[PDB]
Amino acid sequence: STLAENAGLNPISTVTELRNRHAQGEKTAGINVRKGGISNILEELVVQPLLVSVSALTLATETVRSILKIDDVVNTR
Amino acid sequence: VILLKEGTDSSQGIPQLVSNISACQVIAEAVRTTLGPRGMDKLIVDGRGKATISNDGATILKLLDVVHPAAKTLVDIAKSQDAEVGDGTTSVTLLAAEFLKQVKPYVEEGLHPQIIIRAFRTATQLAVNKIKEIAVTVKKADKVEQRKLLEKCAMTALSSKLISQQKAFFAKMVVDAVMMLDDLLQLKMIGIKKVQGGALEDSQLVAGVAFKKTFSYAGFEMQPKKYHNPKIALLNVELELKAEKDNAEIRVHTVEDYQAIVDAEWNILYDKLEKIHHSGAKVVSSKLPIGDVATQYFADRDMFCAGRVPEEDLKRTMMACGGSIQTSVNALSADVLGRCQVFEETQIGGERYNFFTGCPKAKTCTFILRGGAEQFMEETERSLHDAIMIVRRAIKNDSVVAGGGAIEMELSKYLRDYSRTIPGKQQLLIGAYAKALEIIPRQLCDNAGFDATNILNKLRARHAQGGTWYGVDINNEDIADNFEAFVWEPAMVRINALTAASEAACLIVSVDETIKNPR
Amino acid sequence: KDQDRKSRLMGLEALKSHIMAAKAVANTMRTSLGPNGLDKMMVDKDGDVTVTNDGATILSMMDVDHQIAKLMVELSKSQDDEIGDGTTGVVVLAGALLEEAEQLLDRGIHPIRIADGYEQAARVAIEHLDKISDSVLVDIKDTEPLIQTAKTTLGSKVVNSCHRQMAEIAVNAVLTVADMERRDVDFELIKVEGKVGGRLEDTKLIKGVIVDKDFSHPQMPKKVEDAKIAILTCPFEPPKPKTKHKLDVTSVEDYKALQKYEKEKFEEMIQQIKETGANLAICQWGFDDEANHLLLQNNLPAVRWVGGPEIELIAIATGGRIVPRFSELTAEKLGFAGLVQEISFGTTKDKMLVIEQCKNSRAVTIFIRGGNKMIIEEAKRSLHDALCVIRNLIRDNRVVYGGGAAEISCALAVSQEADKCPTLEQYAMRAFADALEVIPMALSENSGMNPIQTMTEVRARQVKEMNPALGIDCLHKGTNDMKQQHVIETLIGKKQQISLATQMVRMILKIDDIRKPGES
């Protein structure tokens, strides 16, 4: 939704078209900012390794979990 | 001390025109979202506390009653539009304010108001000449029967609605209801009634006048409903036993006189009952309720009677049966009695319903609705009324143009390309006049939830390539040829809208001062 | 005119303000959902006080000046005619759909697009209810199971202590006034009355009409078995006016003369009763001691001081006519009935006129008894929904398992079908699923359980354990699977709930501006 916004597209209709494309298709569907629209990501030469998305969810969840487990902050001296 | 105004309020110049321009936009904002069939509604409340909910630009402006005088001019222009056309009040008010919005910064830059009027009078005439050029007459297109094309028009207007699946059934009856009238067509002549419960297919197409028939008094197992040539009585008299209107309170000091007083009070009902039979009225249709005793009278005399009829259905029967309304019953004669070929009580939906058929003055009909709720029938009442207007206007005028803002973009193209070849101050003004036409398709997209930017930009490209009829599709979020989709509007209606819109903007633009006599 | 001080509210803030008005009415009523619903205290304008948990009664007495709330109240007039009991289900579902819509307006979706999705999801859910439904009296008309359904309905009311007896009379009443094959039961033919004293177990069915009026004299015959009833406006005596006679007797010369004329009218009309063949003579006014003394000698019972609308109902029920004067009497204008009895109540002198037909009738009245008027009042409405429960089963014996089982099953179908709609209505379909869960999630809350844990636990049970839907055990019974608990709601009711709820959400969504002029 943020990529579609910066690419000059509708954030809702773009994300919506991808979910139907993903249920019917595969991961090839996505956003191509160079052309400004949905297209085959694998054909447009836009790819990243698996550790980026994996480490993102891992470190993000552990940080969100830590913020959730904090009940109060206490100062000392 | 010796002051010239002495409480007299008055201002003139550019601040007055800019002040009136902003007030004109406030009236458009109250009817900006009502543009289109799927437009948002407006709720209005009066001193009684009852709420009126409708997206009718004509009815909304009548209820606001704004005190600003520049707004009164726009509202008055809508009334002339109703008499001229009957619709297009939202387009005139919305489009007139758009001319004012675009010439607002030029007025502030010192451009004279009179120079602005010369552009509107010029661009309007050039637009009217282009409407008559692009307008096409459609009577026997490809030797297709007119009933076929008229159904495609009503189906498109009713598409994506509560009767979307059964739109074909409603399409046939709407065309058939219009075909049932005479040459002098009229929307007020046709009635639409609602019947709770049942499927959409069970909606009946009555040929004559009918009413809900809230009559629920005694007198059953009698009153033969069928009549071959009855005499229909149109009254507003109450024949109740102990009527709130008719009574006899005669105080006496004699037992024998009370027997006559109780009978005399009964005689008032009986004499009124006999005067109805004296003239030979087979069908008694009264506005006020009727008592159980009066039901037994005509039931024995082989005559029908049922009160609690609304005033509209009586007057709609007045034009149908060919008689007249008579509040009294003494002077009832053939001059007010009606006639029909078939009068029969029907039990559609379990409730009793009376209707006439084949009257001499049968210039009306009735549409019965069947649905699972009252709001499905209230929305369908006006949704079918739009299709009835579309079918009516196609019969009256065969010269039409593509709706959905298709002509507004061609005129925006022609006037913008014409303004380029006009040296002088009329260039920026005629171009501003062109850009103001794009508000009609822009709000049809906004009111429909679509992205007006993507459609109006894609639409402007198709018009530059040669598309003379492409416009906005309320159903699908895409550009479509409204001419091929049978979404048509008359060419004269669009002409009178621009004329009324330009005349309203010019009248506001020509104003410089507002004077107020203190009194 | 009157533009100054004109109230106005427009824009997207108005839609959120309209939603805030509907949520206030839904949050008020979601607590009174289910049999364990929390009651509501009503403070009448005249100083009276009452307590009840009925959704329709709450909306009727709720004095709301907001215009959006008044529309939600108007839906009760259309819903109670079909369902009767769960008007709360429509208001709670409507307020739930509006709350979830507020999350979609922030996303930038138009209100009409939200309404288009709910209408699409409603047809998905309404189509799902037709599949998982089950019949009771398919192809045969029977009275055994039909009585059992109403017995669970009255259990939700204060009359639960005497719920078993009133169900049988409810089936005979509807079957009497109309046939199951006709599928046309009219509430106008059905009437309900009652009086303080006794208990609710003394509820009886009177095939005909009952009016709280006594005979002309206690010495009259207490049984008119023959079917000849006269219904006059004046009594069989010297004619009198409606207010006061004011006879002028100057001296004894006028007394002996007028008494002869008066006594002649006493004998003339009292003997006219047997001329026309009428045994019972019902009259709007009372009889004099001279008249009742002659009625006794002739064995002619008569009723006194009968009310205005009471005289109308006796003519309709007995099949007679409202005779204006004795001169218009005839064989056709005499009413019909099988037995007329005077029934007192213990030590009270009510002595209501009981007109029995001694056969199957077309109109039946329901007499209620109890130790409190307000419990009798709530007892009257307890049968009104039972009439709808019976009327709904007569229109269609197909039904769906209640207790929240239907709402949870439809939410799964609406959620799966949302994947097949590639358009902005998809978010509204998912919102329709979450809004459906508020009804069962509200039942568990009103009973004192964890809502979400009880909600999702029944979801996975509806997906993993078995395909038949399972409800919530809000009454703290053994377990789920409300089919065993015999808690089953009608199919037409659930369809009208989702329909009227989607309509009420559609009407509020397409409204985007309210205008009203203030006091100048």
UniProtKB/Swiss-Prot annotation, chain A:
Positions annotated to bind ADP: Q48
Q: Where in the cell is it found?
A: Cytoplasm; Melanosome; Cytoplasm, Cytoskeleton, Microtubule organizing center, Centrosome; Cytoplasm, Cytoskeleton, Cilium basal body
> What family is it from?
Belongs to the TCP-1 chaperonin family.
Which function does this protein serve? Component of the chaperonin-containing T-complex (TRiC), a molecular chaperone complex that assists the folding of actin, tubulin and other proteins upon ATP hydrolysis. The TRiC complex mediates the folding of WRAP53/TCAB1, thereby regulating telomere maintenance. As part of the TRiC complex may play a role in the assembly of BBSome, a complex involved in ciliogenesis regulating transports vesicles to the cilia.
The linked condition is: De novo genetic variants in nearly every subunit of the TRiC complex, including CCT4, have been found in individuals with a broad spectrum of brain malformations, and clinical phenotypes ranging from mild to severe epilepsy, developmental delay, intellectual disability, ataxia, and other features of cerebral malfunction.
How does this polypeptide assemble, per the annotation? Component of the chaperonin-containing T-complex (TRiC), a hexadecamer composed of two identical back-to-back stacked rings enclosing a protein folding chamber. Each ring is made up of eight different subunits: TCP1/CCT1, CCT2, CCT3, CCT4, CCT5, CCT6A/CCT6, CCT7, CCT8. Interacts with PACRG. Interacts with DNAAF4. Interacts with DLEC1.
**By what name is this protein known?**
T-complex protein 1 subunit delta
- Organism of provenance: Homo sapiens (Human)
* Protein encoded by which gene: CCT4
Q: Which residues of the full protein are shown?
A: 463 to 539 of 539
Swiss-Prot record, chain B:
User: Where along the chain is Mg(2+) bound?
Assistant: D87
Q: Which residues bind ADP?
A: G36, G88, T89, T90, S91, S159, S160, G404, E489, R494
Keywords associated with the record: Acetylation, ATP-binding, Chaperone, Cytoplasm, Hydrolase, Isopeptide bond, Methylation, Nucleotide-binding, Ubl conjugation
Kindly state which reaction or reactions the protein catalyses. Answer: ATP + H2O = ADP + phosphate + H(+)
Q: Keyword Transmembrane, does the record have it?
A: no
Binding residues annotated for ATP, in chain numbering: G36, G88, S91, R393, G404, R494
Give its localization: Cytoplasm
State any GO BP term from the record: protein stabilization
Q: Which GO terms describe its molecular function?
A: ATP binding; ATP hydrolysis activity; ATP-dependent protein folding chaperone; identical protein binding; protein folding chaperone; unfolded protein binding
Q: Which Pfam families match?
A: Cpn60_TCP1
Pathological association: De novo genetic variants in nearly every subunit of the TRiC complex, including CCT7, have been found in individuals with a broad spectrum of brain malformations, and clinical phenotypes ranging from mild to severe epilepsy, developmental delay, intellectual disability, ataxia, and other features of cerebral malfunction.
Describe the function of this protein: Component of the chaperonin-containing T-complex (TRiC), a molecular chaperone complex that assists the folding of actin, tubulin and other proteins upon ATP hydrolysis. The TRiC complex mediates the folding of WRAP53/TCAB1, thereby regulating telomere maintenance.
UniProt-recorded name of the protein = T-complex protein 1 subunit eta
Source species taxonomy = Eukaryota, Metazoa, Chordata, Craniata, Vertebrata
As recorded in Swiss-Prot or TrEMBL, the protein's gene is named: CCT7
Swiss-Prot record, chain C:
**Glycyl lysine isopeptide (Lys-Gly) (interchain with G-Cter in SUMO2), cross-linked positions:** K1, K191, K195, K246, K256, K260, K373
**Which reactions appear under catalytic activity for this entry?**
ATP + H2O = ADP + phosphate + H(+)
The UniProt record gives the binding positions of ADP as G34, G86, T87, T88, S156, G403, D473, E489, K494
According to its UniProt record, the EC number is 3.6.1.-
One Gene Ontology term from the biological process aspect of the record = protein folding
What molecular functions are annotated in GO for this chain? ATP binding; ATP hydrolysis activity; ATP-dependent protein folding chaperone; beta-tubulin binding; G-protein beta-subunit binding; mRNA 3'-UTR binding; mRNA 5'-UTR binding; protein folding chaperone
A single cellular component GO annotation: centrosome
Q: Which InterPro entries match?
A: Chap_CCT_epsi, Chaperone_TCP-1, Chaperonin_TCP-1_CS, Cpn60/GroEL/TCP-1, GroEL-like_apical_dom_sf, GROEL-like_equatorial_sf, TCP-1-like_intermed_sf, TCP-1_chaperonin
Q: Which residues form a coiled coil?
A: none
Query: Which of UniProt's keywords are assigned here?
Result: Acetylation, ATP-binding, Chaperone, Cytoplasm, Cytoskeleton, Disease variant, Hydrolase, Isopeptide bond, Neuropathy, Nucleotide-binding, Phosphoprotein, Ubl conjugation
- Residues that bind ATP: G34, T87, T88, G403
Subunit details? Component of the chaperonin-containing T-complex (TRiC), a hexadecamer composed of two identical back-to-back stacked rings enclosing a protein folding chamber. Each ring is made up of eight different subunits: TCP1/CCT1, CCT2, CCT3, CCT4, CCT5, CCT6A/CCT6, CCT7, CCT8. Interacts with PACRG. Interacts with DNAAF4. Interacts with DLEC1. Interacts with SPMAP2.
What PANTHER family would the database entry show? CHAPERONIN (PTHR11353)
Associated clinical condition: Neuropathy, hereditary sensory, with spastic paraplegia, autosomal recessive: A disease characterized by spastic paraplegia and progressive distal sensory neuropathy leading to mutilating ulcerations of the upper and lower limbs. De novo genetic variants in nearly every subunit of the TRiC complex, including CCT5, have been found in individuals with a broad spectrum of brain malformations, and clinical phenotypes ranging from mild to severe epilepsy, developmental delay, intellectual disability, ataxia, and other features of cerebral malfunction.
| Gene name of the record | CCT5
